[PDB]
């Protein structure tokens, strides 16, 4: 799409329909006449277009009305309501841009933001934009959180977020114009290499992949059509479903063979009855010939009964010979019908040990995508966020993704090396207690109106708690925390002095020996300027490999690489880094997934703020105090950078509405 309607698309909004959020802010319009709605929609779309066409400078209300035409520029308060709405909820003027209106003289309200990940930073910038007092508390000695970029000399490699998953409707598309990201497209061609270290033939590579894709659609069919979603009171996982489907396919292979040989025995048994009939006939033909021979011993002249006997037995012999020929005719037809069936049998097996191994790579890919064993993913919901996927090629931040959080961090009060230990929220306000990570006995107290918690789901999951909530988080919130899945996936960065791989290939796979190890170093990435190869440890392997030293892991890497490129073509790496995300105390994993027994609806529960009880009993219902952003709080874009980014924009909007009021709702 392009034009005004394209700007709505690039902002994840229907161009010709009002969203649920829009209905809340403009209930007058959406309940009103259809004509007004279309006016509204155009104003919204046009303003978005204006911002998107030039996102390096702030778009003021004045500048907006300036570029609007009649009859749309007539109602100036509608234009102001729209512009304010779009500014509040971070659809326009978000990220890094030159400010036309200088920051307000004095700040209103005070917000403490826990964590300076992308979600934290995105919110911070917005709240400061709205003229609030904002301080971020970060346990690490750097901003970015799960956006981690290794830098040494010329080597640059992301250990966390790495891929921009398409610019089509991506908020990162805006950011990429504001921040100098060297975005490079990823050619999706991925050659596979078996355990021995030799390429999978294009014969297999396609016939296995096609079967994989066919197997997934099958699980989807089991989920929706057959409603196979709960088994023995437990919720069915994607893994279970895939197993069930495969087994049914192995069953069909055998069912086919059984009914094929069953066809053979019936033909063979028809031949048996025909041969028995033929032997019994030759038996009689043999004897009847002898009788004719003996009857022909009576030489002429002979009486008529003796003549009759000769004639009679002659008829009876050619009559039975007629039968035998027709039975020998049938014999030839049944005998070739047996060579027909024995010529082309049904398939011998469903998948060979070589096939099943290549299929396991395809499963490992999925286990990398969801950062979890397929036995944990929800059958019904694992891919619920599919509809909201972006369009366009996937890209890599060639100069390292960290350039983004670092850029967002510019101009914000961020306390590094500050580990939040306790969050206290009451009717009158909040206090946050943190310690210095370096010397833990040194204590800090932060008093604020509102707390925005961007603690990773893994951190929120910790047992015993790393962060204490006073009062405890409500049942419904903590239940969502347990139900939701927080996965794990790790990276190995190999830095060489020379390129020994195919420079035109961005990624190549390695096929493991077992199902158990399908995720172990199963994929390699060639993305960066410097000679760097990046290897993935996914699925079950991810968790186990964290208890294994870097040297051993780098060894297994070189082993596989030598097997593929030549034993003396793979040098010793100059620099090596191995991530341990589940081990990391400020992450406790990689990113969330839809666990079995969870749904997309749990993500909504995560985003819902907390309102404390009253101080004095009988005092009025208080303001909401504790707010939640983060990758794990956005139903439609979970486990991503843009998803985090957006959740931060979301909460900043919600907090500003709560503490500065919404003047645009009138």
């Amino acid at each position: 799409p392009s034009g005004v309607e394209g700007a709505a698309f690039q902002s994840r909004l229907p161009h010709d329909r009002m969203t649920s959020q829009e209905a809340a802010c403009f209930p007058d319009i959406i309940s009103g006449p259809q004509q007004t709605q279309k006016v509204f929609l155009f104003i919204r779309n046009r303003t978005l277009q204006l911002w998107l066409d030039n996102p390096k400078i702030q778009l003021t209300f004045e500048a907006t009305l300036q570029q609007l035409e009649a009859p749309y520029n007539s109602d100036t308060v509608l234009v102001h309501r729209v512009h304010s709405y779009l500014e509040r909820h971070g659809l326009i003027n978000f990220g890094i841009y030159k400010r036309i209106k200088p920051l307000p003289t004095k700040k209103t309200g005070k917000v403490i933001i826990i964590g300076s990940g992308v979600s934290g930073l995105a919110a911070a910038r917005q709240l400061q934009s709205f003229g609030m007092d904002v301080t971020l508390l970060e346990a690490r000695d750097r901003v970015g959180g799960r956006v981690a970029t290794f830098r040494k000399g010329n080597y640059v490699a992301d250990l966390g977020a790495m891929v921009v998953t398409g610019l089509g409707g991506n908020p990162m598309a805006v950011v990429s114009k504001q921040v100098n990201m060297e975005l490079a497209k990823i050619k999706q061609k991925c050659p596979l290499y078996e355990a021995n270290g030799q390429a999978v033939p294009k014969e297999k590579d396609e016939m296995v992949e096609q079967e994989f894709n066919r197997l997934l659609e099958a699980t989807s069919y089991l989920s929706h059509q057959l409603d196979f979603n709960v088994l023995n009171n437990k919720p069915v996982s994607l893994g279970q479903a895939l197993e069930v489907v495969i087994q049914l396919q192995e069953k069909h292979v055998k069912d086919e063979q059984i009914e094929h040989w069953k066809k053979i025995v019936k033909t063979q048994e028809e031949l048996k009855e025909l041969l028995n009939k033929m032997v019994n006939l030759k038996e009689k033909i043999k004897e009847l010939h002898q009788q004719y021979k003996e009857a022909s011993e009576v030489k002429p002249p002979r009486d008529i009964t003796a003549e009759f006997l000769v004639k009679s037995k002659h008829r009876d012999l050619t009559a039975l010979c007629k039968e035998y020929d027709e039975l020998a005719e049938t014999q030839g037809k049944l005998e070739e019908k047996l060579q027909e069936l024995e010529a082309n049998p049904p398939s011998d097996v469903y998948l060979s040990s070589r096939d099943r191994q290549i299929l396991d790579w395809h499963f490992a890919n999925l286990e990398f995508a969801n950062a979890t064993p397929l036995s944990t993913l929800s059958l019904k919901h694992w891919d619920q966020d599919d509809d909201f996927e972006f369009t366009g090629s996937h890209l890599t931040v060639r100069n390292g993704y960290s350039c983004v959080p670092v850029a967002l961090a510019e101009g914000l009060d961020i306390k590094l090396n500050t580990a939040v230990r306790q969050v206290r929220y009451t009717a009158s306000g909040c206090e946050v207690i943190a310690v210095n990570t370096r010397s833990t006995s040194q204590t800090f107290i932060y008093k604020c109106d509102a707390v925005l918690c961007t603690l990773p789901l893994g951190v929120l999951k910790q047992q015993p708690p790393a962060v204490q909530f006073v009062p405890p988080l409500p049942e419904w919130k903590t239940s969502a925390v347990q139900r939701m899945g927080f996965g794990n996936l790790n990276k190995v960065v190999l830095c060489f002095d020379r390129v020994f791989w195919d420079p035109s290939v961005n990624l190549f796979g390695h096929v493991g020996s077992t199902t158990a190890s399908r995720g172990e170093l199963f994929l390699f990435w060639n993305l960066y300027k410097a000679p760097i190869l990046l290897a993935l440890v996914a699925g079950e392997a991810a968790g186990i490999m964290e208890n294994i030293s870097d040297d051993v892991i780098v060894g297994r890497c070189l082993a596989i690489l030598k097997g593929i490129f030549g034993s003396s073509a793979v040098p010793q790496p100059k620099e090596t880094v191995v991530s341990r995300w589940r081990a990391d105390p400020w992450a406790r994993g990689s990113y969330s997934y839809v666990a079995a027994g969870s749904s997309g609806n749990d993500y909504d529960l995560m985003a819902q703020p907390i309102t404390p009880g009253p101080s004095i009993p009988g005092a009025p219902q208080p303001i909401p105090r504790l707010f939640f952003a983060g990758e794990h709080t956005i139903r439609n874009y979970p486990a991503t950078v843009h998803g985090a980014l957006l959740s931060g924009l979301r909460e900043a909007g919600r907090i500003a509405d709560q503490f500065l009021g919404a003047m645009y709702t009138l």
């Binding site: 998953t165 398409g166 991925c190 990398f368 995508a369 966020d385 972006f390 997934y593 486990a639």
Partner: peptide, 6 residues
Amino acid sequence: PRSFAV
């Protein structure tokens, strides 16, 4: 999520 898959 699924979109990460190669």
